[PDB]
Ligand binder design. Structure first.
Ligand SMILES: *C/C=C(C)/C=C/C=C(C)/C=C/C1=C(C)CCCC1(C)C
Lengths: 326, 60, 223, 339
């Protein structure tokens, strides 16, 4: 049988022996041993201490001079600023509840943490999509005499903001419910529970049809046209060695980018399709936090593949990190 | 004909014109430059400041 | 507020003309002597459709060009060439029949050492270092007159060691591309042509589309 | 065959006039003026920042209204605006596409430009609505122009790439007179405050003066180890300042043939682009290649003020005659108005 439910919470264990009390009050050590809890706390503290200075430093580097803020690095600055929501709201709270007791905030606190911890992930995802579509439009030249400007980039940043907000807020009232699920540390979304009063089936089918299949198809389309265009361009000018360096550079970076996006937002879609494909399935409580781990690691290795390994940022930000050497 | 054996004749005619010009009194001309600049430098609008009144560059 | 509304209308007109101006590829031509300027300017403008600086303008295959000339206002070189930085493709010109040019205005100056002394004064000049060079070389039918002896060791030391066209023309192109610094990332896209040829504008279009795909990726930071 | 003897005759009389200007041979003015006090620190902040251009800009010139600035962008726009409401008053296209100089009118009526193509184009701005008609076009050269200055509403004076200088009248369309006899190429000039003279600087540091009615040369001033780029004088007509490409701003007097003051400094390493005195003349204004319009005093050779307006190199500047303001021109379209 699936897990047991209270008024406004779900838990992935059975009520066979009658031991699981409310997940807001008196402590729990009967769904997981305490060394698991403290190891989770240590992992999130490590993630805080590494993930704050990368975003703080790229904000300082883009506020120092304006040789760098261009009509195109707006989207990537938005990716730099969305991640500090996930490191500032959605991580210290998990550290707090993992350390002392468990989740002593309250249901309004969960309904706040869920919003501030899904907004960052959603802005990250749609900003990766917008970045891919900007790159394909400005390099492969699909349109008859369309150059690039400033109004279009501010349009794109407003686009990713309105999509992430209007499709991560209707969970707050109506269409879904915020639940603390897993090891009762962070509130996620209610994709697991079968609660039929809150129309939950519509939310899972809507999220899978808008937030994972069309972003994946548009990333594949854009980067495929990009690698085909650069390959066919360097096919012509044979003996020019610099574009023979360029071909290998772009066909390594596209592969590493697509694999980074897929292993940062696959396992959520994995457990959702597995839950929907077998109505009625039992799971361990440690099993439904590995998608949270595989998602929140994109608070560190998502900027390091778009900022540091990117050109034009690194050689300036290192020499205004300590201004000593490379 | 073009410039070569003509520019030198023009230059030595210029230099023969130049030798007849008298000049001295470098200390006197430096004093005169001194008292000309210090005669008016007190009422200069750039050396002292702006009392927010007539300079037509208020911050608006 | 009539003055302010007038300035707003003028500002809209100015920015409209600026975004109209931005979609062109400003090329810069140069080259000393009688080095095929007449042929390369005839073979550019009107053949496809069947004392200051001379601005000839042409367009072909959905990309509108514009090129200038520096051939009529000779002066001190190092003072106005900075006003051309930021153009994309510095078209050079050199004449392949330069072996027989005994003089131009002096008593003894070969034309080959002159154009080499001009070409070194650009690739190291610190105003032109991130702009590629589309070299040319023409009058090849007169260079096909090397069947009669006219040995290549007159304007060189004994290097080519051959007489036919297939080995000599390979030696001159290496002699230019070795004088290149290769300081930063730029590369020189040579060619070969004559007078009665055609469709070499296809070559300069296929070249200039490779300082756009190769260049835009630097701005995105991908390459 | 014989002109080597002419050179040998010239050399000893050149040394003769060298010791003739070493007859007085007093030092610079800082050696005598120990009594005076320094000007003290002086600081300016940006009051208004202009906007509207896209390209680099080269030159500007204050009007005699002390209210109107003109400027010349690289694409072909010649802009003429106010400095009170910060809004554009006219916008002129060019039949050419380059600029290297500009000039306003002492009558405050109409302007003149002309760049690499060897043309001085005078544009009327009096009776036409909007885009104004090209009033006159004046050829007569085979080299690039360098600077134009109005001396009345009638005659202009120009200095071109053909190692000449020429005084023209504009309703006849020809040269009234020439000013030849100059080895290197000229670079700038400025009109003496009583419309009689203009000092002229060139490649080989040979700053020479001229007079208009006689139409011949007057004197020589050679005091620099390299090329110069801009010259102007003191407003009461006694002395003129000069700046070179190796940070050697110097100052001469019109009747002394002597380096009256050097303003060199040990730190600065890159050249200048423009120099203009202020109204009082207590301080010399200048702009260098290291992005700075650092302003010297004019009496005791000290870096009085340092102001870094913008990131690229300054191109040209120049004060207003009533001295209330200072304009400067960037290389990236921002026209700062310091106070
Ligand atoms: C702290 C938690 C984070 C950042 C997790 C956020 C997860 C989502 C916004 C999930 C989205 C989807 C689901 C509802 C399940 C299937 C996969 C998605 C992406 C469609």
């Amino acid at each position: 049988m699936n897990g047991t439910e209270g008024p406004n919470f779900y838990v992935p264990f059975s009520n066979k022996t009658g031991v699981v009390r409310s997940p807001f009050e008196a402590p729990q050590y009967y769904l997981a041993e305490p060394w698991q809890f403290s190891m989770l706390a240590a992992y999130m503290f490590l993630l805080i201490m590494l993930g704050f200075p990368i975003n703080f430093l790229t904000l300082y580097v883009t506020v120092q001079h304006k040789k760098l803020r261009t009509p195109l690095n707006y989207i990537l600055l938005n990716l730099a600023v969305a991640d500090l929501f996930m490191v500032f709201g959605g991580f210290t709270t998990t550290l707090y509840t993992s350390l002392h007791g468990y989740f002593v905030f309250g249901p309004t606190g969960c309904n706040l943490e869920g919003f501030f911890a899904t907004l960052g992930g959603e802005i990250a995802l749609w900003s990766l999509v917008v970045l891919a579509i900007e790159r394909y439009v400005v390099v492969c030249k699909p349109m008859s005499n369309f150059r690039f400007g400033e109004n279009h980039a501010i349009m794109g940043v407003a686009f990713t903001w309105v999509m992430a907000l209007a499709c991560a807020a209707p969970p707050l009232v109506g269409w879904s419910r915020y639940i603390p699920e897993g090891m009762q540390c962070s509130c996620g979304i209610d994709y697991y529970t079968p609660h039929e009063e809150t129309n939950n089936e519509s939310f899972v089918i809507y999220m899978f049809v808008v937030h994972f299949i069309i972003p994946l198809i548009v990333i594949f389309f854009c980067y495929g046209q990009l690698v085909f265009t650069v390959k066919e361009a360097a096919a012509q000018q044979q003996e020019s060695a610099t574009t023979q360096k360029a071909e290998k550079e772009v066909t390594r970076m596209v592969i590493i980018m697509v694999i980074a996006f897929l292993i940062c937002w696959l396992p959520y879609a994995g457990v959702a399709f597995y839950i929907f494909t077998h109505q009625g399935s039992d799971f361990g409580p440690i099993f439904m936090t590995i998608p949270a781990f595989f998602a929140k690691t994109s608070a560190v290795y998502n900027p390091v593949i778009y900022i540091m390994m990117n050109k034009q940022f690194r050689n300036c930000m290192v020499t205004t990190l300590c201004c000593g050497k490379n | 004909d073009l410039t070569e054996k003509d520019k030198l004749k023009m230059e030595v005619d210029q230099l023969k014109k130049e030798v007849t010009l008298e000049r001295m009194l470098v200390s006197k001309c430096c004093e005169e430059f001194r008292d000309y600049v210090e005669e008016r430098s007190g009422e200069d609008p750039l050396v002292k400041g702006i009392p927010e009144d007539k300079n037509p560059f208020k911050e608006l | 507020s009539a003055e302010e509304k007038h300035s707003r209308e003028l500002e809209k007109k100015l920015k409209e003309d600026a975004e109209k101006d931005a979609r062109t590829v400003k090329l810069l031509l140069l080259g000393a002597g009688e080095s095929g300027k007449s042929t390369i300017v005839k073979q550019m403008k009107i053949i496809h459709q069947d004392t200051g600086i001379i601005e000839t303008q042409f367009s072909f295959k959905d990309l509108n060009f514009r090129m200038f000339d520096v051939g009529g206002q000779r002066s001190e070189r190092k003072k106005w060439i900075h006003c051309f930085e930021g153009v994309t493709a510095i078209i050079f010109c050199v004449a392949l029949s330069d072996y027989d040019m005994v003089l131009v205005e002096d008593d003894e100056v070969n034309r080959m050492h002159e154009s080499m002394h001009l070409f070194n004064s650009i690739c190291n000049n610190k105003w032109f270092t991130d702009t590629s060079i589309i070299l040319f070389l023409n009058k090849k039918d007169l260079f096909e007159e090397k069947i009669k002896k006219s040995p290549l060791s007159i304007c060189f030391p004994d290097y080519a060691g051959s007489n036919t066209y297939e080995e000599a023309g390979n030696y001159i192109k290496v002699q230019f591309l070795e004088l290149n610094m290769r300081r930063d990332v730029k590369e020189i896209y040579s060619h070969m042509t004559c007078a009665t040829d055609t469709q070499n504008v296809k070559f300069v279009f296929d070249a200039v589309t490779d300082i756009i795909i190769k260049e835009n990726l630097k701005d995105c930071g991908l390459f | 065959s014989e002109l080597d003897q002419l050179r040998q005759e010239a050399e000893q009389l050149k040394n003769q006039i060298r010791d003739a200007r070493k007859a007085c041979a007093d030092a610079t003015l800082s050696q005598i003026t120990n009594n005076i006090d320094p000007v003290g620190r002086i600081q300016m902040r940006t009051r208004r920042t202009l906007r509207g251009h896209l390209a680099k800009i080269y030159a500007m010139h204050w009007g005699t209204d002390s209210r109107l600035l003109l400027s010349a962008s690289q694409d072909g726009k010649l802009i003429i605006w106010d400095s009170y409401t910060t809004n554009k008053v006219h916008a002129i296209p060019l039949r050419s596409s380059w600029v290297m100089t500009c000039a306003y009118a002492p009558s405050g009526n109409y302007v003149a430009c002309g760049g690499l193509d060897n043309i001085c184009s005078i544009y009327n701005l009096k009776t036409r609505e909007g885009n104004v008609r090209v009033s006159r076009e004046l050829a007569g050269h085979t080299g690039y122009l360098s600077c134009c200055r109005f001396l009345d509403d009638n005659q202009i004076v120009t200095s071109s790439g053909d190692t000449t200088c020429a005084l023209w009248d504009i309703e006849t369309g020809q040269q009234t007179t020439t000013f030849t006899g100059h080895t290197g190429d000229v670079m700038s000039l400025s009109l003496a405050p009583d419309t009689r003279l203009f000092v002229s600087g060139a490649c080989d540091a040979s700053a020479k003066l001229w007079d208009v009615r006689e139409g011949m040369c007057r004197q020589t001033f050679t005091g620099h180890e390299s090329d110069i780029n801009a010259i102007c004088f003191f407003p009461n007509g006694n002395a003129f300042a000069t700046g070179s490409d190796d940070a050697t701003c110097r100052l001469f007097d019109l009747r002394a043939d002597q380096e009256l003051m050097t303003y060199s400094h040990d730190n600065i390493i890159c050249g200048i682009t423009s120099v203009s005195f202020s109204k009082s003349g207590r301080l010399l204004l200048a702009g260098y290649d290291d992005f700075n319009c650092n302003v010297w005093d004019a009496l005791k050779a000290d870096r009085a003020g340092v102001l870094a307006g913008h990131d690229n190199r300054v191109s040209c500047l120049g004060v207003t005659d009533d001295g209330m303001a200072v304009a400067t021109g960037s290389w990236d379209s921002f026209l700062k108005i310091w106070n």
